[PDB]
Every structure is written in structure tokens, then in C-alpha cells.
Amino acid sequence: SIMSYNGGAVMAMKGKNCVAIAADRRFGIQAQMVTTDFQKIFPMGDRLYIGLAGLATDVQTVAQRLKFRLNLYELKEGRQIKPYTLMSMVANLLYEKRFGPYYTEPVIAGLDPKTFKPFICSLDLIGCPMVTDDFVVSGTCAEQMYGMCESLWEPNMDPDHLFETISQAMLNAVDRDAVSGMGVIVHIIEKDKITTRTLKARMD
Amino acid sequence: ERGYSFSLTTFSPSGKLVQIEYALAAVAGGAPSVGIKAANGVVLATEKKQKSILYDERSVHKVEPITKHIGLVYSGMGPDYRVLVHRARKLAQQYYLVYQEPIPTAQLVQRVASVMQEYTQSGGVRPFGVSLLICGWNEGRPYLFQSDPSGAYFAWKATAMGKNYVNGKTFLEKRYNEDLELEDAIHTAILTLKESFEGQMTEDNIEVGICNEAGFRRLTPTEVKDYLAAIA
Amino acid sequence: SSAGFDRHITIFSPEGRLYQVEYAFKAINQGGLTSVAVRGKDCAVIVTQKKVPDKLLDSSTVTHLFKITENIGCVMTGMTADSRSQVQRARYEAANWKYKYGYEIPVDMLCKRIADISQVYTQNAEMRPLGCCMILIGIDEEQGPQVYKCDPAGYYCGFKATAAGVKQTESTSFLEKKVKKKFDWTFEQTVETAITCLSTVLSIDFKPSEIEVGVVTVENPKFRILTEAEIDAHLVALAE
Amino acid sequence: TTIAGVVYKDGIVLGADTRATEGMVVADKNCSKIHFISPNIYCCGAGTAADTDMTTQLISSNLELHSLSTGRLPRVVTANRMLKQMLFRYQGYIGAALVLGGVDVTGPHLYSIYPHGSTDKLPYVTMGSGSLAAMAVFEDKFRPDMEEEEAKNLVSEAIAAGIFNDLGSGSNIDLCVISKNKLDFLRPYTVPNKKGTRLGRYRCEKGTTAVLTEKITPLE
Amino acid sequence: TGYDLSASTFSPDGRVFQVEYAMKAVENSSTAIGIRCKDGVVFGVEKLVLSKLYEEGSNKRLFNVDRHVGMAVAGLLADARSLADIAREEASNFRSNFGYNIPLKHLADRVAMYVHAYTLYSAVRPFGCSFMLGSYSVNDGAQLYMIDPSGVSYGYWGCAIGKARQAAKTEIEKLQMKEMTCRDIVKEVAKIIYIVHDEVKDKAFELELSWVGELTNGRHEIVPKDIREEAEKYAKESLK
Amino acid sequence: TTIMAVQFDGGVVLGADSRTTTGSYIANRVTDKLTPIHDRIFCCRSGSAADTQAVADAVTYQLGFHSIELNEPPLVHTAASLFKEMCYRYREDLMAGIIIAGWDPQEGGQVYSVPMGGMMVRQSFAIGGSGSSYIYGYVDATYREGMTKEECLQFTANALALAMERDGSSGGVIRLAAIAESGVERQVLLG
């Protein structure tokens, strides 16, 4: 697909009091990879990231446009943004190109700014949001990560088993995948700190 | 029209803007009002005396909600007041379109004051002789914002605008304090409004709106006559 | 207190005035015309005289009672051009309401839109502020009959005993002395009080060929202009 | 997606099934498709979900504006006129299958909206992909002026038949009750399908995965 | 004095002097009368030859707007030409948009609103024109309207525009207008124009008579006045 | 689908079926195919539903506005002209099967036809809809000039009956309209 023009896979997963987001490192054209350090996970303020997958043009574009609007909002109001507001903003920004659409599947993961309430959601390429409580996936490979997360997820998870669960899920579902691989980056965050680990993925 | 497009408001040798000062004087020659921010809610109250015994008190309403949780009163001229009310309505609903969340009162005052400031500078139009008193209970803490024809704005614990507003203000400073309830704020607001109004004050001379954390509320003359029937 | 050019355009004066609009509140007074509205119960009555000294001039096309919509009538004073332009704008916004919102426009919203257009003319300079006054009447469900008045300034209001034109300080004095006794208004009461209050103002006590009577009732919500015969019937019915 | 409407002797009962699929995969198991408009009027959506959501939020903004301007309860016909006018401006590009219901002063009024802009008033409608099963249950067992429990049971049975035909939902079908005074709204109405408890479990260990570069960054 | 400059301002007593000055511009223009019979409307314009340099049949103030409507202007001639072009355009629009003849009431109201729009702002001046509008339709009868420079448009049986505004309508009203067909009204208008101002201020004038009605089957054109020659053989019998 | 208007001496008689179909599935079993615009003027529509609804609403707007500004009852030919202009100007996107009928104070009953092209003609009787061809087969056989009202009602009854019986897209229920000087009399033949 045109979504499979540059590969890509973003997994988010809600734990007990914490949220884990991961993506793949590979970038390249249809059969030819180029680099192993492409960025798809972006920090939008504190304890709140976003992931973008699909066409890398729209990835970097919408990342910059959302950063533009986010810094405008965060300077117009002294508080930091709430995740539902970010979801609505992404929905509006995608829906403005109702017929000129960006080819991306944004995934938002952030905690509550006031409490330690987690939040995950995902959208369509036209702006259909969807909040769940277990996991949201995007990118080219879907059914792989669906089967793995419906196989491995438990509701109430400490960050350690959360990390291991999302690690095994991403690794196996990527190793089965063809156009998306070449290293995995993992962001496992909580109220207290931000952890970023990288896995020894199969480079095949 | 032709689109002549020049502004009538230019600087004095003193550096003043005499049209804006005249507009403020025209505000000050208007109907009194009182607005008090209590510890849990905010009380708005105006003073509405009909010219004859022929007028009805069921058609024109001074106290006005902008959202379900943001009240808004004025002291000035209704024909300008309705215009900027409608502008604020459309503006707030554009915000609720974009963000899917109720607009905060500070954001209202930013945008409305920017529009009003734009009318102060743009071509040929007079400024609007209206002093707002915007309020609402957004995120627990309630707020109270006064604006003016100059496009500026403030934030008061309690204030007054209209006839003898300085006298009402000096009564407010001695009577009102930092911490009360909505009922005590209503009590002292009716006291400071009845300090300056005419002698015949009824359930229809005044119009009172409160601001719970449950939302904006516009009281009825039923509970006004429950309360303002010789509240002290 | 003529500072700047406050005698010419819509700017603020010293001390809080602006003279162009409060010159327009006597722009009604060159009409030489008088209008009275009455709402006591579930009917609503307009009455307004003509002044035709000519035999060459018609009588049908001289009426100021203007059917805005099927349930909304109005009467005009002041100068004729501003009145008729306001009339077309009112009809146009009524049809726009019916197209956008799917149902019949209430007289309240329409008078509010008219007042807003009055402000729009008031706001910019180099624009003449339309010296006509508009009284509207109509029936609304769950509220009955309604009476509204529209100023040139854009200050509308809605109230029971209503009169604007030339001589209405006296008319409102009569209506303060009249709408205070708590009698009901059983529609002959309304017509009789309207004709007799205009009779106490002008002191003419005249033929049925001079006043036009606009009525609307909660039995037939259609706007209704009275005929010469029934106007004569009410006139001789109050003739004792 | 199977939304259905009905008019009982006082008001309107709306139900919906909440499996928002993206192609061939169950992408959601809980998707509110019964949208807010007003304190008296709701709406249900079908087809392109994002288009229905954006459109219903725009119309809800417009009616909140109009109602707060007017000072009284809104009318269903106004919402109908706005929706048909907007969808006909978009020339049938926007795919939005809407079911409009509300209680005015005039009473209950149900409308169905087809995304080109054709509108109907009917006492019961079905829209969506599995709409035919609910239409079967209706045309079998509808009678005019039903009771409350009768209408609730009927709409539940209809969307249940829709779920036992293809592209229903796992969900606990959502219902909604609009009456002259009492507005009600029920998300977890009736769960027919319990999740089969895994006798596994696919377990793991805290260290079973090779780590290359860890980083710690504290906060406040 | 000072207020009278702009066309947007009001006076300290409440009127617009621009419109008044425009009204009394037409007062020095030629006298133009018009009267309807029971099956048609008759126009008539006292037209003057300057000294010897005209051609008896140029610059005719009796225009012809629609298939059944024509104007009888007085005042500024080029302004009248522009106004008649506007009326031709409006009737063309109505014919295009509804497929039949424009009614005279709606046409006159569109024209009156156009005139009002030129009276409002300061960007333009008011018109210096005052004109007649005549009609005939089998489902409508004969209709005669009248438009001032301000924009007040209503109906008459007879009218006059010019110097002898009063001095013609003094004896217009003694004409038995209803019981006559227009073929009498031709020589009636002839004797009216001939009576006013025979030789006193000027030396010579000249007569034109427009003619709409049932006798033309709804057409509107000038009479063949030379056919039946009704003025002169009655004019010489009208000096005694 | 199948719509039909017939004038008689006093007034006109209209009529249509109900069923609005999409593909081979019926979305709506019962439908007001004929629409009041003025209180003496109807139109019955066919082709697309949304297009004709929008056009009828716009005609309602302009015609009501114009009729109020006249302060007189409107003509039938005027509304015919309005549908003609709205169809012909912004054609290439519409499917209009519009039939205008109605009583007039000046002209009695008249019936105008506007097909998918945009031409305007005055007829004495008219068909419209996909399943109109068959009863158009015999509406020129059964018709007699100078019928009464009951003859027109029985006439359209038989006509729409056979139209509903033979064509698959038609069916549902019979709705009739009787427009005259006196009033507007609508009734629903079923079963």
C-alpha cells in the first residue's frame, strides 16, 4: 500500500498506572532501506508523546504542524495540554485535509497532567479518534500486533511486565513482518520518570 | 460603501485618545451593576428600572449566559451589548468546535478584548460604550473579569460599574472581604446595589445571575422575591 | 458642547452623548402620524390614522399596516422611504428564517434581527440612520400575543400599552392612567380603548375612513386588517 | 454498524452496536455512535465515522448557538433542515448515514438521513450495513403506540438479531430513551457474549528480552 | 447652514436639506400632468421650444419603459434617462425570471427602493427627477403611480409635476374622471395644459400626450394627436 | 415513482405511489411524493429524492417571498417558470421529474410538466416516473374530455393501480389530491 511505501509500526499499550509506546527504527523506500535511526515518536510536552506512521513526508510535516499549534496553545495558556485536547487538535488538523489527506495514523499516548491517569488513543487518516484501554496499533502490519496484544495483555500491570510484554509483542510481530524492522525503540514512561530502551532486534 | 477606511481616533498633543475617554464617560453615565467573586461562586446583579409602568420584564434580559457556565453582564448601551454578545457566542462555539471542550474565561477575555481593541483602531467606526463583567467557574477556581471600551481588561475580587460606581466601590471595600459564600455575596451585592438605586426596588428592578461550580445559573424573580423581600 | 465634529457624524461627544441618533428620534416627528398598540388578553390591536386631504389621491395604497408574514403584521411611522426599506428587510429576513430553520419566525427574533441591522447602520459613519420606528405584533404559542417596538437606535423592547409617533407623551400618560385598573381585555375592550385613547389625544371623534385597525387574535392567528363596516360597527358601538 | 430508531407512545428509543471496524479487522469493541446534539435531540451515525462525527459536532454547535440565542427548547425540523442542506452542499461526497430523533413541544419526531441529502420522517428506521436484520425484527413485530418496556425489548431484540448476522458488535448494545421530561442513556445494557477466560497463560519474565541502551530522566 | 452639505447628516430640527433641495430642483422644470380614465391612463407634458433651434420631436420626456408602461418625467433630463434605464432593466429581469408582465406596484416599489438607496449615503446625491408611471392590464385595470425625489411612491387618479402643481390639480379634481373613457380625457388634458400659461412668462410651448389603456389593447404609445387634432380646435374654443 | 396529474373543469386531481427504492431494496415503504408549496399549488416529484427536495424547498422560498410581496395569490405558471429556471440553469446534475399543478383564481386548474431536460409545457394530463410508461399506454385511451371529479378520481385510481401492479419499482399505497377553488382534499387509498 501507500501506507506500505515506507513501512512503519507504532504500538501503544496502557498498563496499570503507566503507558508504554514503541515504534520501529527502519526507514527506506519500498525495497531498499536507508537508515536505522529514523524518528517516529515525538515528545509533545511532558509525560505525553505521540507516534506517527505511514508516509514519512506526512510524518515529519504533521509533526512540525502539530508542534506549531501546540506551542501556540501552550504560550496562549500557561498550563500544559490535556490529552483529549491534543486528540481533538490532531482530529481538526487531519480533517482540514478532508480531500487532501495526509497518509498517517497518529497514535497519542500521555498521562494525565493532574493525576496519574493513563491515556491512549488512535486516529484514522481522516480524523476518526478511538479511545481504548488495552492497546492501539498502527502502521502497515496490523493483525500481527492485534493477535500478539490480544494474546499477551493483562489489565493491571507493573511497568516491568508491561515492558516485557510490549517488547515480546513488538519483536515477534516485527520479525514476522517484511517491510518493517531493523531495530525497535521503546518509550516506557510513568509519573516519576521517562525510560527509553532499545532492543537487540533481528536485523534480518 | 466606498471604503474610506481611516480611523477617527488619533493622538493628542497630550497623547490621549479623547474619543475613548468620552466612550468611558458614556459608560459611566450608564446603569449601575455589581459583581462579586465569593469563595465558591460568583454573583452578578444589575439594576433595571423601566421608564414607565408599561414596560415588560420578560423580553429584555441584561444578565446573559455565553456558555452554560459563563455569565456576562454590562453597563452601557444594549444595541452595542447585543452585538458583542453575539460575537462572543460565535467565538466560543468556534473554540468548542476546535478543541471539544468548554472555553476558559481568560481565553474569552483575550479574544473578545482583541476584537474590541480592533474596533478601537480600525476605520471610522466608533468604539463600543460597554463595560463587561465576565465570570465563570472554570476548573474549580471561579474568575471575574472586567473589560472596558479601551480593549483592556482586569481581574477583580469585586467591583461595580455605572452610576456612582466609585461610591459603590468604596462601600464594597469596607463591606466585602475575601471569603464568604454565594448567599452572603448575594446579600452584600443587593446591599451595595440598593445603596445607590432608587427607593422602589422590587423583584423586577434587579436581575441576578450566579455562577455555581455546577454551572452558570440565572435566578428567577420567584427566588429573588424570596430573597430580596427585605434581605436585611 | 460641540467639540470636534459631533454635529455631523457618529462620534462620541463630551459628557457622553452622540447627536446624530438623538436627532433621529425626532425624525419620526416630521411624519405627522400617530400609532397605538394594545395587548391585554388573547387579541392584539393596532390603530393608526391616515391624513389624506386630496380627492385625487387614493385610499388603498396609503395604508401603513404592512403584512410582513401570515402571522406577523406591523405599522410604521416616520418618513416613508426608511419605513418601506425596513419593511422589505423584515420580510426578507422572515423568509430566510423560514428557509434555514424550517418553521415560522417568532416576532421576538425578527425584531431582534431588525434592531441588529439598525446597529449595523448606526455603527459606521457616512451612513444615514433610517429615521423610522417599527411596531410589530404577532401571536406566539405558549406566550399568546406579543407587541414589540423597534427604535432607530437599535433598542427594541416588548411591552403591553404601546405608542410611538408625534403625540405619545400624552398617549403614554393616558395609558399609565388607563392600564392600572385591573380589568380584563375582552377585545371590544381593546378596540374601544384604542379608538378612545386616540380620540382623547387628537380630539376629533371622526368617520371610520381615517383610522386603519390592525388586529390579530388567538382564534385566528392570521394577521387581519379591518373593513370599513366593522370599524363603523365598533365606532358606533362605543358611541354613547 | 446497525442503528435503529422507533417511536413508542411518548418518545423515541435509539440503539446501536459499537464495533468500529477498519477494513477486515475489529478495530474497536466500544465505540459510541449515539451522538449528542441537544438536551432533547440525539443522533446516530453510520458509514464514514469521522465524517459523521465532525458533522454532528458542527450541527450541535450550531443548535447550541441558536438555542442560546432564542431562549427556548430547539426544534427537530431545524436540525433536519441544517443537516440536509449541509449534506446537499457537499454533493454526496461526505458519506454520513444519520438517524435523527428528538422530542419537541410537538412531541416525538424521527428522521432518517441518507448521505446525498434525501430525508424521511418514519416511525421506525434502520441504517447501516447490518440494518436489514433490525428492519426484519421491526417489520415483523412493530405495532403503533407501544409501551416503554415493549419498545426497549423490541430495539434490543432487533440489534441482537443484527449482531447474530454479520458485522454486529461484541458490545453490550447501547440504548437511549428520549421522553418529554426524562432523558436516559445506557451504555452497558446487556452483555450476551462473555469473554472466554484464557486457560493459558502466555506468560513471560522480567528480563527475558535483550536490552541495548537504557535511559532514566526524572521529573517533578 | 453648515449641516446642509452632506447627504448623510441630519438637521438640528430633524430633516435632510439635500433631499429638500433636490425636491425643489424639479419645481422650475416643465409642467407634466397625468390622469386615468375608467379604461386607461393618459399622460401629458407641457413641452417648450427654446427659441427656434429644436426640431419638434427630439428629447421626448414621455418615455416608454415596458410593453405596457411608460414614464412622464420632469426635472433633470439625463438623470431621468438613467432612471428609465434602471426601470427598463428591472422589468427585463422580472420578465426573464417569471415569464409575464411586471405588476405596477412591485415595479414602482423596486424603483422607490433604488431612489432611496441613492438618498441614503454621502457618496451620491439625491435625484432631481419626479415622474409618472402608467399601466393597464385586463386583470388589473388602470394604475397610476407617482415618485418624488425622496422615494415616496403611492397612487393617484390625477397628478401634476412642475410649476403649476397646484394650479392644474385645482381643476383636475372637477373632472368627472370615472364616467369618462380616455378619448374624452385626451381633449381634457389638452384644455388643462392649454389653460395654464398661454403667453405670459414665455412665448411658445408644445404638447405631447402619451396614451395607455384598453383602446390600445394594453399597448402604451403616444397618441396620433394629429389624428383628430383635438387640442387646437378645442383650444381656440377654450379662450372664451 | 409513478406520478400523475389530471385536470377537470373545476380543479385538478393529482396522484402518486409511495415506494422509494434504492437498487432492488425498498428504503421507504410510504412517502409523501407530492409536496405542498403554496396552499393552492402542489408538485409531485420523481427521479432523485434529494435533488427534488432541495429544488422544491428553494421554490417554496422564492414563491412564498414573491407572493407575500405581491399581496395577491400567486399564479401557477409563475411557479412553473421558477422550476423551469432552477432546473435548466443548474442542470447536468439533477434528475427532475417535476409536475406542477394547482388551482388558480384567474385561470382555474392548470397542470405543468417539467421532465429531466428542463422544458416547460402545459398539459391536460401528465405522467411521470419510471413506471409511468404503461399507464401512459392507456391514459390516451381511457381519457375523455370533460370529466367530473369522481371520474378523475376513479381514473387515477385505475391508473396508479395498474402502474403499481405491473412495474416492480412502483407499489406501496395510493395518495390522491383534489385541488379546487374550495379547498384541498387529500386521501389515501390503501388495499
Curated annotation (Swiss-Prot), chain A:
The modification N-acetylserine is found at residue 1. Keywords: Acetylation, Cytoplasm, Host-virus interaction, Nucleus, Proteasome. This is Proteasome subunit beta type-3. It comes from Homo sapiens. Pfam families: Proteasome. Belongs to the peptidase T1B family. One of its GO terms (biological process) is proteasome-mediated ubiquitin-dependent protein catabolic process. PROSITE patterns: PROTEASOME_BETA_1, PROTEASOME_BETA_2. Non-catalytic component of the 20S core proteasome complex involved in the proteolytic degradation of most intracellular proteins. This complex plays numerous essential roles within the cell by associating with different regulatory particles. Associated with two 19S regulatory particles, forms the 26S proteasome and thus participates in the ATP-dependent degradation of ubiquitinated proteins. The keyword Transmembrane helix does not apply. InterPro entries: Ntn_hydrolases_N, Proteasome_beta_3, Proteasome_bsu_CS, Proteasome_sua/b, Proteasome_suB-type. The modification N6-acetyllysine is found at residue 76. It is found in: Cytoplasm; Nucleus. The gene is PSMB3.
UniProtKB/Swiss-Prot annotation, chain B:
SUPFAM superfamilies: N-terminal nucleophile aminohydrolases (Ntn hydrolases) (SSF56235). Its main location: cytoplasm. InterPro entries: Ntn_hydrolases_N (IPR029055), Proteasome_alpha (IPR050115), Proteasome_alpha-type (IPR023332), Proteasome_asu_N (IPR000426), Proteasome_sua/b (IPR001353). The modification Phosphotyrosine is found at residues 4, 22, 74, 119. The modification Phosphoserine is found at residues 5, 12, 14. It comes from the Eukaryota. Keywords: Acetylation, Cytoplasm, Nucleus, Phosphoprotein, Proteasome. Phosphorylated on tyrosine residues; which may be important for nuclear import. It is found in: Cytoplasm; Nucleus. Induction: Down-regulated by antioxidants BO-653 and probucol. Down-regulated in response to enterovirus 71 (EV71) infection (at protein level). GO terms for cellular component: cytoplasm; cytosol; extracellular exosome; extracellular region; ficolin-1-rich granule lumen; nucleoplasm; nucleus; P-body. PROSITE patterns: PROTEASOME_ALPHA_1, PROTEASOME_ALPHA_2. CDD domains: proteasome_alpha_type_2. Gene3D superfamilies: Glutamine Phosphoribosylpyrophosphate, subunit 1, domain 1. It holds the Pfam family Proteasome_A_N. The modification N6-acetyllysine is found at residues 68, 169. GO terms for biological process: proteasome-mediated ubiquitin-dependent protein catabolic process; response to virus. This is Proteasome subunit alpha type-2.
Swiss-Prot record, chain C:
It is found in: Cytoplasm; Nucleus. The modification Phosphotyrosine is found at residue 155. The modification N6-acetyllysine is found at residues 98, 100. It holds the Pfam family Proteasome. The keyword Repressor does not apply. InterPro entries: Ntn_hydrolases_N, Proteasome_alpha, Proteasome_alpha-type, Proteasome_asu_N, Proteasome_sua/b, Proteasome_subunit_alpha6. GO terms for biological process: positive regulation of canonical NF-kappaB signal transduction; proteasome-mediated ubiquitin-dependent protein catabolic process; proteolysis involved in protein catabolic process; regulation of inflammatory response. Glycans are attached at residue 1. GO terms for molecular function: endopeptidase activity; NF-kappaB binding; purine ribonucleoside triphosphate binding; RNA binding. The modification Phosphoserine is found at residues 13, 59-60. Keywords: Acetylation, Cytoplasm, Glycoprotein, Nucleus, Phosphoprotein, Proteasome. Its main location: cytoplasm. One of its GO terms (cellular component) is extracellular exosome. Disulfide bonds: none annotated. SUPFAM superfamilies: N-terminal nucleophile aminohydrolases (Ntn hydrolases) (SSF56235). The keyword Acetylation applies. The 26S proteasome consists of a 20S proteasome core and two 19S regulatory subunits. The 20S proteasome core is a barrel-shaped complex made of 28 subunits that are arranged in four stacked rings. The two outer rings are each formed by seven alpha subunits, and the two inner rings are formed by seven beta subunits. The proteolytic activity is exerted by three beta-subunits PSMB5, PSMB6 and PSMB7. Interacts with ALKBH4. PANTHER family: PROTEASOME SUBUNIT ALPHA/BETA. Belongs to the peptidase T1A family. NCBIfam families: PRK03996.1 (NF003075). This is Proteasome subunit alpha type-6. It comes from Homo sapiens.
From Swiss-Prot, chain D:
Expressed at a low level in colonic mucosa. Up-regulated in colorectal cancer tissues. Keywords: Cytoplasm, Host-virus interaction, Hydrolase, Nucleus, Protease, Proteasome, Threonine protease, Zymogen. Its main location: cytoplasm. Belongs to the peptidase T1B family. It catalyses: Cleavage of peptide bonds with very broad specificity. GO terms for cellular component: cilium; cytoplasm; cytosol; extracellular region; ficolin-1-rich granule lumen; nuclear body; nucleoplasm; nucleus. One of its GO terms (molecular function) is threonine-type endopeptidase activity. Coiled coil: none annotated. One of its GO terms (biological process) is proteasome-mediated ubiquitin-dependent protein catabolic process. Component of the 20S core proteasome complex involved in the proteolytic degradation of most intracellular proteins. This complex plays numerous essential roles within the cell by associating with different regulatory particles. Associated with two 19S regulatory particles, forms the 26S proteasome and thus participates in the ATP-dependent degradation of ubiquitinated proteins. The chain holds residues 44 to 263 of 277 of the full protein. This is Proteasome subunit beta type-7. The active site is at residue 1. It is found in: Cytoplasm; Nucleus. Its EC number is 3.4.25.1. It comes from Homo sapiens (Human). Transmembrane segments: none annotated. It comes from the Eukaryota. The lineage of its organism: Eukaryota, Metazoa, Chordata, Craniata, Vertebrata.
